[PDB]
DNA sequence: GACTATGCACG
DNA sequence: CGTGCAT
DNA sequence: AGTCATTCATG
DNA sequence: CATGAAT
């Protein structure tokens, strides 16, 4: 039957249940590689299941199903609505999904049911997963004991600010603008160098926020605001062009506008003004966007001023609004608000972390081998008792250990040894397994450095960046203004 | 429900009957908005030949298409007040896209004769594969694969360029060249009678 | 530039395709394994992924979309209803998916999001599915080129009467009622001995239909018309009983009701006939189903004549309604009105199939190993020689060859020697290959009876007919009353 | 009518019962004694009480259906005697969101109907984590002298019965506003429109690692 | 995560 | 009508 | 295969 | 008024 609690008490293990795992495990990016969960186990699952760039697109519902049986137990909807936006370039400045079909358009109408799209990791995407293999991330069990997963991607790229997120949790929100490869790089880059940089000089190499959809962006003060305490307001600003018809009259046209904004919406308001004369002189509004190019037409009346009427559309809509900073992340398992140092510092922590894993395990696999390699050159002056001994033995198990007494070999060996097939008995060529212990004992060297020289590391380190620059950088789309 | 064209034009402008809002999405986007409207058709469409005219007309999908084709519908029908030049069908390449075709035609040809006598009406023809449209079209670009299961799975840009670009798309157009061996048609196919039909199946389908 | 067909031609190419493909390929089962495509799929699709009776349950949408993905290019809305369906042990007689969470009940009312539900194969849809990888069945490939599909399933029991089918395709439809699987067991084992037996004789074993739901059937005259030319109008009632109470106020309870039939609505139905009064004197209708049992009490009023209430419901209710066979299935590529005989005959001409395809298959595999075990006998005579012959040989192949040349090894046999692991050299007892060789003629043998003579074949066919019917066999449900 | 009934009008043993979800909301209609017991799916996440407006609270479907079947209405005009039934019980996924239900619920059977929650009469239901059958990762080793339940739309309706709804095998946490001043101020800071004490809060009650 | 409407053959 | 694969 | 509603923190 | 993972 019944037991009692409290009303302040069965509000405490529960809202503080609910808290943490919506804080630590939903609704905010980690700071090292920039993924909620939901993402993160997205693009492992497409990736276990070689769902990548260079094979087929696979139906959407074939992934996402699979997402949700083997790590992510919550909604298809909500886990397809996640795999849709990673594939829109409107929201991702460096898009992680490719998807076949209807997944949307700045006007915001909905994305094909996931019976009808298919999808496919990018090339980039690849990079966020490199060397995953290798065992250089942490795994942990799924909701369902079957399978291990990561806890955080390799993130060959800075991707928390290269893509941006956002953001609504419990006590604490997110919002984090997309930046720039190329400058979040040589960011990055400059300070593997000096670890003890001002933002002030940080900014000469990331110079402020660049939306995949443009624009403009102003607040030189309030950027350095951000960068500095995290939380910052700066203005973004749809690029304007201005057409004299013939007839006196003067047209606006758009042909960028704000993060975040939809198109359809916008025109619409934009409209609403035009019928309700809130201010004078627009003639008509006539949304112009084809499959190549936006383009909003604003004409206006003949003698009207458009300076009167172009500011009070700024204003007054969505033409024109105040982005805010909020950069929020989770580091070490908790939420912390963060600027560009903490961010930048954090990643190369990270990568660091990551390029030593990866170097103890190819040196591991190199060790391994190079030990056999030891093992069987040896065997070969040997290779008639051998044999006569593998012959005397009693079975697999009684010639391993026969091997290791008689001969000093050691198990790992003992093991190649005795499951060699009888035709490798033709080959008596050492020369040619000689080059190989000296490519492996030079493979090892290298790692190994590596691994014990800090400096060593870091211009490997840089040497990635650098070409992860070289591969994926493009322009600003989004102007700076003072 | 219906995206109308930017400009109204009774003699140039083009409707196009989709077969479900996704793929009436990936239109949407491809459209030259100037002269394209897009009316989506939300799932198999109501036999008109086999249901009274009373239901008929209460069928949503059915409403707001007398009303947008802007000429009413049957006898009260001003072929002259049409609102299109030319009404396209544009419907996946599957079997259920060919039913619905079915369907539309059969609603075109009793309660519009006149839009279908007049040529207005027309059947878009994406493709089946990529960029080759029949079996053999498609041998031919092995020499100097992905595979469409419905206008769905293509996209936006690719859509334009392959259907509805009037430059660069090839188009039906229902003829009904005799009124009487394109009435046993209908009424045999979709009547209210299954007999007639199980036969026409039984004589004119080789099931190899 | 626009071609010009005709509208009588276009119509006649278009609702052809759609009669053709929804006819052979949607609404109608074949005739030996009784499948609709979306079900057959649906269970070779779960099969391929070890989603089985024995292994765990399963997130329903990981099947939905892997099922999607690979064979069943539709909604994923469509998939799960049918696999649905196929676990609700009162809609099939003997339930092909089994399915943990909410899959509706009686009442009507929906099954839980596929979100929710996990899910796998019965025991006995192991069953249907038994030696298909013994290349047992015609394959196609699937919609995408990339994976071949069974056309047909094996069927170790034979399914299209047993679960029944329905039903709704272009031109023609379908009906068939469940039946109990040991019965149509019987019923075949027969017709094997006896292939011109007459429906009569077949009866005897074959009484009629079992619904799951249970019930009593009328009509032993159109069951034979029914076994006859296919169609035939059965009468099904509801199961009732009386109850004594007090005040002598009788009570109509009742404990079964007709297949296909929604509890809800035949309760609110009934209860509609006490409030419109269209029967004389019913107290309250209620529904008193719980977990564990099924009960409609119909409560009635203190003189109250029970049996016009009890007949009044059965004439203007569907306490008791008519089935009608219908039975169409799928024989040779085209719609077929079959009874009871073409059904349980081409069940027979099909496992017959099977059972020799499996069985050259089998004989093959252990012809190909009796071979290797030839080889290996004769070597361990001449070890040594062989292994001296190997090291003087150049490589793998110079081996090959010299093993032929010089003892008249066969290349299948060289192939298999020259691969052996040293350690083999160890386990080198011949009196256990001889064994093997011996326990492999044998089978070779008994494999080889079975291809060359029709009456051996017949006689697995019942051997393994049986086992099927000891294994699942099960009391009938529906009683019959002619 | 959103809700399932009971079968008798009994407002004496008489449970309403609120799940989350029309998922479980099924599997515990299927799985009920149906003569006391009645279901009420909660189809969403119920509405934050102490956050939004007393005009938008009252236009909320998923609150009318529950001032109507609870049947004594909100506010003031809150006859505690006048209701439809004993035990008020809260059922929900034992997850993280299940506890944010539980929670929000809460606040409403306090703000707009106090009595019914001082009365001893709302309950939380107590679904089992794995499977003999068990509630802490503790209870589990004792059985092991192996299923994991990712909540209740994944458990199977006469399960949800012998575990859960039976009013003897059955463990029901018991609400009750002991100190009905200590618990105004967690009701308020927790769910209230004010954010900076929640996250202060969180940071000194909330365990990271 | 429920609701909403069609086609098809059949009593 | 209510069925069950399909839109 | 869209449509409806709620959380949570922010300007 | 939105936003985007969640019910
Ligand atoms: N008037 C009703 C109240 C509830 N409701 C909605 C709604 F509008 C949308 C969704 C929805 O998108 C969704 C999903 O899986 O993505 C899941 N659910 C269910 C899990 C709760 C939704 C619900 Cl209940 C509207
Ligand atoms: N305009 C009408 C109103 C009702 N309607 C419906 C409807 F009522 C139910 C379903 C439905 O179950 C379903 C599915 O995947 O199982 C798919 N569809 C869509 C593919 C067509 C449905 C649609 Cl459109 C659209
Ligand atoms: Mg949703
Ligand atoms: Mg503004
Ligand atoms: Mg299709
Ligand atoms: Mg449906
Ligand atoms: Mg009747
Ligand atoms: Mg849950």
Redesign the pocket.
């Known amino acids: 039957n019944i037991q009692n609690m409290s009303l302040e008490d069965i509000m405490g293990e529960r809202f503080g249940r609910y808290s943490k795992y919506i804080i630590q ?3 905010l990016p980690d700071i090292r590689d920039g993924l ?4 993160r186990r997205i693009l492992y699952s497409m990736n276990k299941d070689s769902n990548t760039f260079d094979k087929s697109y696979r139906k959407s519902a074939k992934s996402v199903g699979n997402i949700m049986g083997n790590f ?1 137990p ?2 298809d ?3 397809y ?2 795999m849709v ?1 990673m594939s829109q370039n409107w ?1 991702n400045r460096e898009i992680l999904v490719e998807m076949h079909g209807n997944n949307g358009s700045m006007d ?1 109408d ?1 994305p ?2 996931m019976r ?1 799209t298919e999808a496919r990791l990018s090339e980039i995407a690849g990079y966020l997963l490199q060397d995953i293999e290798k065992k250089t991330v942490p795994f942990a069990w799924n909701f369902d004991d079957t399978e291990k997963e990561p806890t955080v991607l390799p993130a060959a790229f800075p991707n928390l600010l290269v893509n941006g ?9 997110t919002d984090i603008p997309p930046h720039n490869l190329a400058e979040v790089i040589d960011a990055a880059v400059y300070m593997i160098d000096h670890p003890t940089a001002k933002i002030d000089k940080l900014m000469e190499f990331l110079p402020g926020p660049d939306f995949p959809t443009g624009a403009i962006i102003q607040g030189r003060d309030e950027i350095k605001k951000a960068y500095e305490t995290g ?1 910052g ?1 700066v203005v973004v600003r749809s690029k304007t062009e201005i057409e004299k018809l013939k007839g006196g009259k003067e047209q606006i046209v758009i042909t960028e506008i704000p993060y ?3 198109k359809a ?1 916008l025109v619409k308001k934009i409209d609403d003004v035009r019928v309700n004369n809130k201010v004078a002189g627009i003639a008509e509004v006539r949304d112009e966007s084809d499959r190549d190019g936006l383009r909003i037409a604003i004409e206006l009346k003949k003698d009207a001023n458009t300076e009167l009427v172009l500011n009070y559309l700024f204003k007054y809509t969505d033409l024109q609004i ?1 982005y ?1 900073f ?1 950069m929020v992340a989770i580091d070490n398992f908790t939420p912390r608000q963060v600027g560009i140092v903490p961010i930048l510092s954090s990643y190369i922590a990270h990568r660091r972390e990551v390029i030593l894993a990866r170097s103890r395990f190819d040196k591991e696999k190199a060790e391994k081998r190079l030990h056999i390699v030891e093992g069987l050159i040896r065997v070969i002056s040997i290779l008639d008792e051998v044999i006569a001994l593998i012959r005397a033995s009693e079975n697999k198990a009684d010639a391993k250990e026969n091997l290791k007494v008689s001969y000093d070999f050691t198990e790992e060996q003992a093991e190649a040894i005795v499951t060699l097939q009888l035709y490798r008995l033709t080959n008596t060529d050492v020369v040619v397994l000689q080059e190989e212990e000296a490519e492996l004992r030079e493979k090892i060297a290298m790692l190994a450095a590596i691994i014990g020289d800090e400096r060593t590391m870091y211009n490997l380190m840089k040497k990635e960046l650098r070409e992860v620059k070289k591969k994926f950088a493009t322009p600003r789309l989004s102007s700076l203004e003072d | 429900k219906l995206t109308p064209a930017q400009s109204k034009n009774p003699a140039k402008n083009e409707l196009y009957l989709v ?7 990936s239109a949407k986007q491809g459209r030259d908005r100037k002269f394209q409207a897009i009316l989506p058709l ?6 008109t030949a ?2 009274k005219m009373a ?1 008929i007309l ?3 999908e059915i409403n707001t298409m007398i009303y947008t084709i802007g000429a009413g519908v049957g006898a009260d029908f001003s072929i002259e007040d049409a609102n299109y030049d030319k009404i396209i069908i544009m419907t ?1 390449a ?1 079997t ?1 896209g060919a ?1 619905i075709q ?2 539309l035609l059969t609603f075109f040809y009793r309660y519009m004769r006149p839009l279908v006598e007049a040529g207005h009406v027309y059947i878009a023809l994406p493709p089946l594969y990529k960029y080759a449209w029949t079996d053999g079209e498609l041998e031919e670009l092995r020499k100097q694969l992905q595979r469409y299961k419905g206008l ?1 799975e293509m996209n936006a840009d690719q859509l334009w360029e392959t259907t509805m670009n009037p430059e660069t798309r090839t188009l039906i157009r229902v003829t009904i060249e005799d009124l009487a061996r394109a009435e046993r048609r209908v009424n045999v196919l ?1 009547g209210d009678k ?1 007999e007639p ?2 036969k026409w199946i039984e004589d004119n389908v080789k099931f190899t």
Chains 1, 3 share one sequence.
Not at chain 1, 36 to 39: F, T, Y
Not at chain 1, 165 to 173: E, F, K, L, P, Q
Not at chain 2, 42 to 47: L, P, Q
């Open positions: 495990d939903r609704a909620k969960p939901v993402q992510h919550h909604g909807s909500s886990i609505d996640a936006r929201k915001g909905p094909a049911a009808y997120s956002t953001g609504i949790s419990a006590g604490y929100a939380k307001r975040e904004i939809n919406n105040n805010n909020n | 077969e479900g809002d996704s793929a009436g999405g939300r799932g198999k469409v109501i036999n086999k249901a239901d209460k069928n949503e996946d599957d259920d039913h079915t369907l769905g979709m299954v039909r199980r």
